[PDB]
Amino acid sequence: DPKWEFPRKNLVLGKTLGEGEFGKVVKATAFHLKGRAGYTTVAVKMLKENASPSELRDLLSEFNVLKQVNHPHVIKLYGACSQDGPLLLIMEYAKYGSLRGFLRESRKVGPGYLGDERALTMGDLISFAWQISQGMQYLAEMKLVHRDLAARNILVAEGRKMKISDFGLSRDVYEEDSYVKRSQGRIPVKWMAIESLFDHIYTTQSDVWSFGVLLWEIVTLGGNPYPGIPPERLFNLLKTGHRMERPDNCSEEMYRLMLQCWKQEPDKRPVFADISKDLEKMMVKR
Amino acid sequence: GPLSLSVDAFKILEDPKWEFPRKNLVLGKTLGEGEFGKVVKATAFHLKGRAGYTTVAVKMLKENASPSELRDLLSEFNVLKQVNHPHVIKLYGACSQDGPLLLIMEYAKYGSLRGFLRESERALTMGDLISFAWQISQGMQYLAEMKLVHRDLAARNILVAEGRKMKISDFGLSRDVYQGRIPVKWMAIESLFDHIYTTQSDVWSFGVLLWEIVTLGGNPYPGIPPERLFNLLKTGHRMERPDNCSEEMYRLMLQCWKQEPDKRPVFADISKDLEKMMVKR
Numbered sequence A: 001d002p003k004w005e006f007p008r009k010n011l012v013l014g015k016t017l018g019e020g021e022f023g024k025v026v027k028a029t030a031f032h033l034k035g036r037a038g039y040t041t042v043a044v045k046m047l048k049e050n051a052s053p054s055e056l057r058d059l060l061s062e063f064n065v066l067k068q069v070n071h072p073h074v075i076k077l078y079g080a081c082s083q084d085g086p087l088l089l090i091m092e093y094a095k096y097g098s099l100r101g102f103l104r105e106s107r108k109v110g111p112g113y114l115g116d117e118r119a120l121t122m123g124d125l126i127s128f129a130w131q132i133s134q135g136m137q138y139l140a141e142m143k144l145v146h147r148d149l150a151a152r153n154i155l156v157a158e159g160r161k162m163k164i165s166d167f168g169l170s171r172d173v174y175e176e177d178s179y180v181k182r183s184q185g186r187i188p189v190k191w192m193a194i195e196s197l198f199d200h201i202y203t204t205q206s207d208v209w210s211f212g213v214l215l216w217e218i219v220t221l222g223g224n225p226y227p228g229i230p231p232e233r234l235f236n237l238l239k240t241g242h243r244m245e246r247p248d249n250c251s252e253e254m255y256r257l258m259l260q261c262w263k264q265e266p267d268k269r270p271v272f273a274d275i276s277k278d279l280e281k282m283m284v285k286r
Numbered sequence B: 001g002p003l004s005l006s007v008d009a010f011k012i013l014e015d016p017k018w019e020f021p022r023k024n025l026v027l028g029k030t031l032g033e034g035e036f037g038k039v040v041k042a043t044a045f046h047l048k049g050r051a052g053y054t055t056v057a058v059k060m061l062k063e064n065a066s067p068s069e070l071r072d073l074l075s076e077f078n079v080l081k082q083v084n085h086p087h088v089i090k091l092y093g094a095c096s097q098d099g100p101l102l103l104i105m106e107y108a109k110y111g112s113l114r115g116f117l118r119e120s121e122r123a124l125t126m127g128d129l130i131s132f133a134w135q136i137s138q139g140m141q142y143l144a145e146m147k148l149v150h151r152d153l154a155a156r157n158i159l160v161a162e163g164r165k166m167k168i169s170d171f172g173l174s175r176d177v178y179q180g181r182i183p184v185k186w187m188a189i190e191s192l193f194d195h196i197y198t199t200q201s202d203v204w205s206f207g208v209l210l211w212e213i214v215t216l217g218g219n220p221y222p223g224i225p226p227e228r229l230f231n232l233l234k235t236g237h238r239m240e241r242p243d244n245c246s247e248e249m250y251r252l253m254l255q256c257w258k259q260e261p262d263k264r265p266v267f268a269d270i271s272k273d274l275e276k277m278m279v280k281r
């Protein structure tokens, strides 16, 4: 695709920013990128060593989705090097790294959380969740299920702007408004809706469940969901109606929004437009 | 769904052959973590009615495990409880009643074959490498006769136990003849193009393993990205004879990579070529 193809000689790769089930991401610079003169600092996504077909399919899927979507709170694709060498996706650089990393650093780095980019209040946290909701609201309009919504898969960029990232597992639902997988998925159990875990059904409403988990991660400043609970225990724990407890740093209204995202019946869960409205009300009143 | 049914069976059956009391198990240092989960060294008291403490390896889910990772563990339990061979890593038991699911396995003090070769500045004869290749062939021959496809054969997925005995490990992806999770550089052409896996696709993987052995842990198709390998294999390219590799050994490799699965050797033939190398010093 000439719209996206970038000259490989104008890209220079540097240190690894992260490596895992999502693949490899390095910090880079691009010369004469999309008409910007001189060098622009970028992130480059590529396959890790000993890549499987699934990891190549995920890199290509990501390329295909980010070609079609544009939102202030979705990480930007700028280009690709897809000829005569490894597939490289050139992306928007997010200087603060993952949201999980950023929130966790805030327990340790002053001014920290207060109940300046390192100073955080409950207002900041509600704003982070609101930015992510708006991104997801747009993605749902675009008939996309992300499936991998989690604090580790959100990026924090210039001005502490939230950028939804990690589109490798995202799927089109234009027909039936569900994505169904015969085999077992690669989404961590503890972020999965009950119907995704038992029935392999992914919808915008299963993204709403995952958003509720992300909400619990945000207010706990990067806490580990269902802490101490082995993942195989979540089958029984969720079907008997157990949900994570209200954490210490959480209003009743915020906990009620989480509980609503974890309703057993997907249709009883709020939609992203309603989540964005609930987070707007919370902001304004405080 | 299929996984909730297996998890629940596993927590319920409490099979006295396999269930090991959690209080008799003492977990020690981490041996390895990755896509295969987490394995730690441990001691097990009265394992299988053995006296005192047996040193064991314990496999468990790593952090943030997916349904795929949990299915791989149960699936390993399912396959390994049915197999018994000196060059296949043994299952001794499971803990399914007390916190995280644990599999209790034969311990391999030298770790992975890949790690054991890359540190070889230890001394190996071509005779040893060919012993290693032969042992794996024996394990694979026994698995194929049981109609199990391993799918995942690689030097990183072979363990080295006491006396440098080879142990085939990583049975999570294995299938009983009668998804895209294997690294592309170990996959047969028909697995890449048509998603077929048979004993003959295990033989292709075995040919890549021979090449890792002879290069003392080399990286297959060095500096070729996996995305390009699809067209290079399709057009009949294969890795060059490596340094310190006989014609005989390299001919065995090339036959494991025939395009037509029917033209590859079976494991009995691979075993016989290494038995014949052996007697012919």
Ligand SMILES: CN(C)CCCNc1ccn2ncc(-c3ccc4c(c3)OCO4)c2n1
Pocket: A017, A018, A019, A022, A025, A043, A045, A075, A091, A092, A093, A094, A095, A096, A097, A098, A152, A153, A154, A155, A165, A166
């Ligand atoms: C798991 N997710 C977050 C992977 C997202 C992969 N795509 C991108 C795109 C742009 N940027 N800009 C910075 C990073 C980055 C920084 C630190 C990290 C990092 C990515 O992964 C862990 O630590 C990045 N990644």
Ligand SMILES: CN(C)CCCNc1ccn2ncc(-c3ccc4c(c3)OCO4)c2n1
Pocket: B031, B032, B033, B036, B039, B057, B058, B059, B089, B105, B106, B107, B108, B109, B110, B111, B112, B156, B157, B158, B159, B169, B170
């Ligand atoms: C990827 N494969 C090899 C994982 C196999 C997992 N099952 C077992 C079973 C028994 N043992 N006894 C030692 C190890 C071990 C040591 C160092 C490692 C290691 C496993 O993995 C990497 O480094 C072991 N693993």
Ligand SMILES: [Cl-]
Pocket: A045, A075, A165, A166, A167
């Ligand atoms: Cl990404």
